[PDB]
RNA sequence: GAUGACUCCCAAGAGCUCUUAUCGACGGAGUCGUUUGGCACCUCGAUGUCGACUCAUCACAUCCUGGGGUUGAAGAAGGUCCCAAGGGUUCGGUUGUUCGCCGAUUCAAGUGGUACGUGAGUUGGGUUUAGAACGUCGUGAGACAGUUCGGUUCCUAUCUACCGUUGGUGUUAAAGGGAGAACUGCGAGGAGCCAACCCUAGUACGAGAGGACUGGGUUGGGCCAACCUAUGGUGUACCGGUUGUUAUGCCAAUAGCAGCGCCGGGCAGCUAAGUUGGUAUGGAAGAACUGCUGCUUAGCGGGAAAUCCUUCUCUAUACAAGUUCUCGGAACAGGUUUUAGAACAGAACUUCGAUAGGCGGGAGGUGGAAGCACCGCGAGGUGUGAAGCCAUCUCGUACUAAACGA
């Protein structure tokens, strides 16, 4: 994947921040079915161009969504106003090269992404709460017809006077699993719309039933 | 959504008594996170007073009980909300005191003699319109 | 076995925080946290 | 970055002395012990061992530095990351192509006396692997190593 | 999943009638529809090419495990049945070669994709 | 450290020729602490003993993958040896088995350490209590390092360790100095698998038989991360069928109860049997191993699934405590929820409002409501009628509860 979008030979173009709308099922011309995800880009715009000259690093501050003065907390109302930039639901920074540097106040959209090529998403995933092992890590469990008060628990660290009561950094039942996990080197974008600025992807994009995803690798 | 921590038979057979008493009397003082639950059966038993047919009456015969609060509904609550489209209870949070830190709540109907928060007037709904998705409100400042 | 040091350290961070904003029925007597049904008028 | 390299001289006592150790590119340990003294204030008369009066000593041009023998590719630095198994190891060639400051900083750190004023002494030490330093406008005393270098020579 | 201990029907016209799985050459749970299984004959006519108590390979043709084609479509037969192939006791050249003369009972044409075109050609009619 | 395993020394003889490919007789040299052991130093006012399950971890003296030397290496399969621990190391049959034999497989079915790992994690079959019996010994009481049957497994976690979640605090500063975002990422973790098949190619090699080297391509398994739109499973406040009984006088239509009473269904949610997605490139240093210079001191270059950077994750209590924007009645706090959730936390909404409920409209599930009309004596059927209802989902509407005068 090269010679597309808008840049020179080699750089990283900025990322674009969208919302997981759901999944559906398309078909191809060769009569085969692929699952589909629709990522909705809410008129994302540039709100701060970060600078090695002044600040120290090369970053485009893309805002997404829409918000209202009754919903922002004044310390950011001031930010948006000083930038003179329409209000957005969530901010997000990207580090991109010296080229691929945008003017304050240029909106982005899905035609930034050439179809047929790949992306990398980052979606703060769907935690499940204070789960335990055997689901958190796919541990096994002792039988259900012989052993008591263990039917679903775990084992015990290596342990004896040597490795003296020193459980190394092991694997225990633990709190939730909501985090940001990329799906590296995604599979090509089916289609993106001129209006409505959606985009369909072959499937399995992390993030909630809405409100969370980022995209890069292009 | 609430379980209240009760076997799903006993839970109903309590909620029935609660809505029925809420209709016999006009106000009750109950634990809030359970008032937040009769908040639904009361209205779905007002709707049957509004419909009043034989079908939607013999159905209410199952959900309300104790006394002829059945007739109380059908006769007065209809005629006092023949217009009010939705929202037939107030569910205020009195937290009076208990000995168990359990909150407490007044729950009672709306257009009576002495209500608690002197209501707004029952206005008929406006009729539906087609939804659109412009997403054109910049909200800049 | 474990002494005042640890006992105080454990019972401390479970300290009582004075309650924030607290309102009274201007004339109807009672005092209350917000969002209560003290009174009527 | 003038800021991020000017350090925390806003924290020490300043009012004693600024001194400059510029290794001419000769030898680690014989730079080092001299430092571990000057940067411990045991070299002036008014010493008292319950305090820090370490003078500012500033080393210069650690790129031009010489370590004899062939330890360069033999003596690594070893460190243990807690996680079972691991032992992250790095030779001195790696270390010197990375940052030839860390080398001597760590060395004098180990030489300094093993008490909790050690960190509170290194808080009085700064390094540039050039000759270029922003600590010039302050009273600058360049320093000379002892006149004790006979330097035995071999065939 | 057709796995160890399963007891599935022979559906070619070789000697054996009932064949009891012991393996799945390319699974770790049972083998889904269309994959070679290893198994031990359990009953035969006295005169066929195969005699009871003899490890023999096989290919799956009917499995109560639902399976979907790539078309999103899904199919699931009633019972488990397989057709024999001569064991590896013959070299790699004969890989995927049957034993009998004619199977009988509907067959899925995922055998083609799975490269079992040999048994496929004999099929009554491919589902 | 005797025996033990391994290495090394020497080299009679075997290897048709040949000592050293491969071995290697006699006799020695050492390394390790794993079998057998020796000693009796810690523990008998207690250090719970075999095997299995779970959970791993290290060493490398290497089973495969990974590179090279060499071969009695034509090619291919090998042999042996050097480097190498990154990732792997299967199921089942009899036995309690560890071991081991076996059958079926794989790239391989590694050797030890870790109190012969692991009972305040589990099991408790052996074995070391009481019963009982067989053979043998004892002249009996009884024993058996022989055999078989049965023979209570305690602990509410203080601390260290460890998985996670948070509150305070320190951080020059200007407002009493209080904050909200947005990074950078000193540095820590994570991921590194393999087969088949096709091609190049019946090409090099070989008399064919046979059968390459390498690089590209596909198809699979394992491992891991993520997602339920479909399919399955469930779906306990849904729809319908249905039995026993009690009530609403009875018909009608409902209710309670039978641990959804039992059936057939079942959306959203959750899960995997399903679906995705990864198993990389680039860069440096550099292993034996290999070459060339040298100038006898040295010089550099290839050179391994290895190490370190690039991806992913975590991070400024990173104490040299970092940088940018903005707020200053600013941040909180409380209330309705939540795609988030044990409390806390995050995120949404807080009346110039869609935050939840409610009501209307659909969607989505069940599957022909009641009353009425007909047909038949009836059980019952047909029409009125995709009727009737509604757990969820969307969409309209502030009708309810989320302003605030502390």
UniProtKB/Swiss-Prot annotation, chain A:
GO terms for cellular component: mitochondrion; ribonucleoprotein complex; ribosome. It is found in: Mitochondrion. Residues 143-166 are annotated as: Disordered. The keyword Magnesium does not apply. The keyword Mitochondrion applies. Part of the 50S ribosomal subunit. One of the primary rRNA binding proteins, it binds directly near the 3'-end of the 23S rRNA, where it nucleates assembly of the 50S subunit. Belongs to the universal ribosomal protein uL3 family. This is Large ribosomal subunit protein uL3m. It comes from Arabidopsis thaliana (Mouse-ear cress). The gene is RPL3B. The chain holds residues 64 to 281 of 324 of the full protein.
Swiss-Prot record, chain E:
The keyword RNA-binding applies. GO terms for biological process: translation. Mostly expressed in leaves and inflorescences, including floral organs and meristems, and, to a lower extent, in pistils. GO terms for cellular component: large ribosomal subunit; mitochondrion. It is found in: Mitochondrion. It comes from the Eukaryota. GO terms for molecular function: rRNA binding; structural constituent of ribosome. The keyword Repressor does not apply. Keywords: Mitochondrion, Ribonucleoprotein, Ribosomal protein, RNA-binding, rRNA-binding, Transit peptide. Its main location: mitochondrion. Belongs to the universal ribosomal protein uL14 family. Binds to 23S rRNA in mitochondrion. Part of the mitochondrial 50S ribosomal subunit. This is Large ribosomal subunit protein uL14mz. It comes from Arabidopsis thaliana (Mouse-ear cress). The chain holds residues 47 to 173 of 173 of the full protein.
């Amino acid at each position: 994947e090269a010679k597309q979008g808008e840049m020179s030979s080699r750089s990283k173009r900025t990322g674009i921040i969208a919302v997981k709308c759901g999944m559906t099922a398309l078909w191809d011309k060769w009569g085969k079915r692929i699952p589909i995800s629709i990522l909705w880009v809410d008129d994302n715009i540039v709100s701060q161009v970060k600078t090695v000259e002044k600040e120290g690093i090369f970053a485009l501050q893309i805002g997404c969504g829409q918000k209202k003065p009754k919903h922002l907390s004044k310390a950011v109302v001031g930010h948006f106003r000083a930038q003179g930039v329409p209000l957005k639901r969530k901010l997000r920074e990207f580090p991109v090269t010296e080229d691929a540097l945008l003017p304050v106040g240029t909106s982005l959209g899905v035609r930034h992404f050439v179809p047929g090529q790949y992306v990398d998403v980052t979606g703060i995933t769907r935690g499940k709460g204070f789960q335990g092992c055997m689901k958190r890590h796919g541990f096994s469990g002792m039988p259900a017809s012989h052993g008591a008060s263990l039917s679903h628990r775990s084992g015990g660290s290596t342990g004896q006077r040597d490795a003296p009561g020193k459980v190394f950094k092991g694997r225990k039942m633990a709190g939730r699993m909501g985090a940001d996990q990329r799906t590296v080197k995604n599979v090509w974008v089916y289609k993106i719309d001129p209006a409505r600025n959606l985009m369909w992807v072959r499937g399995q994009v992390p993030g909630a039933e809405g409100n969370f995803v980022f995209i890069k690798d292009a | 959504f609430r379980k209240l921590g009760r076997p799903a038979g006993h839970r109903m057979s309590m909620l029935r008594t609660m809505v029925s008493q809420l209709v016999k009397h006009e106000r009750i003082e109950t634990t809030v996170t359970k008032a937040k639950e009769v908040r639904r059966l009361a209205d779905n038993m007002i709707q049957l007073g509004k419909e009043g047919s034989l079908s939607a009456a013999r159905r209410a015969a199952g959900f309300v009980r104790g006394d002829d609060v059945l007739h109380k509904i059908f006769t007065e609550l209809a005629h006092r909300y023949k217009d009010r489209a939705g929202g037939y209870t107030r569910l205020l949070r009195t937290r009076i005191r208990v000995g168990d830190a359990a909150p407490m709540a007044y729950i009672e109907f709306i257009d009576r003699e002495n209500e608690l928060r002197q209501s707004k007037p029952a206005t008929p709904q406006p009729p539906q319109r087609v939804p659109l998705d412009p997403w054109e409100r910049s909200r800049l400042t | 076995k474990i002494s005042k040091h640890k006992r105080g350290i454990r019972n401390g961070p479970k300290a009582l925080k004075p309650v924030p904003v607290i309102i009274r029925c201007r004339s109807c007597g009672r005092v209350k946290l917000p969002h209560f049904f003290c009174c009527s008028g | 970055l003038k800021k991020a390299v000017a350090g925390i001289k806003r924290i020490n006592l300043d009012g004693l002395r600024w001194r400059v150790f510029d290794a001419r590119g000769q030898v680690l340990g014989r730079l080092a012990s001299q430092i571990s003294t000057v940067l411990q204030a045991k070299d002036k008369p008014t010493y008292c061992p319950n305090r820090d009066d370490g003078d500012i000593c500033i080393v210069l041009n650690a790129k031009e530095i010489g370590f004899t023998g062939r330890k360069l590719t033999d003596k690594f630095y070893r460190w243990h990351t807690g996680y079972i198994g691991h032992l992250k190891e790095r030779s001195l060639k790696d270390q010197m192509a990375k940052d030839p400051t860390e080398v001597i900083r760590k060395a004098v750190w180990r030489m300094l006396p093993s008490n909790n004023l050690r960190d509170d002494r290194d808080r009085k030490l700064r390094i540039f692997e050039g000759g270029e330093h922003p600590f010039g406008d302050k009273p600058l005393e360049p320093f000379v190593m002892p006149p004790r270098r006979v330097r035995e020579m071999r065939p | 999943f057709i796995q160890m201990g399963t007891v599935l029907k022979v559906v070619d016209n070789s000697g054996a009638k009932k064949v009891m799985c012991i393996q799945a050459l390319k699974g770790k749970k049972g083998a889904r529809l269309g994959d070679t299984i290893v198994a031990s004959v359990k009953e035969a006519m006295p005169n066929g090419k195969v005699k009871k108590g003899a490890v023999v390979y096989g290919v799956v043709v009917r499995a109560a495990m639902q399976r979907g084609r790539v078309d999103g479509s899904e199919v699931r037969f009633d019972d488990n049945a397989v057709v024999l192939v001569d064991s590896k006791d013959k070299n790699t050249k004969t890989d995927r070669q049957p034993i009998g003369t004619r199977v009988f009972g509907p067959v899925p044409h995922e055998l083609r994709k799975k490269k079992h075109l040999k048994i496929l050609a004999l099929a009554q009619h491919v589902a």
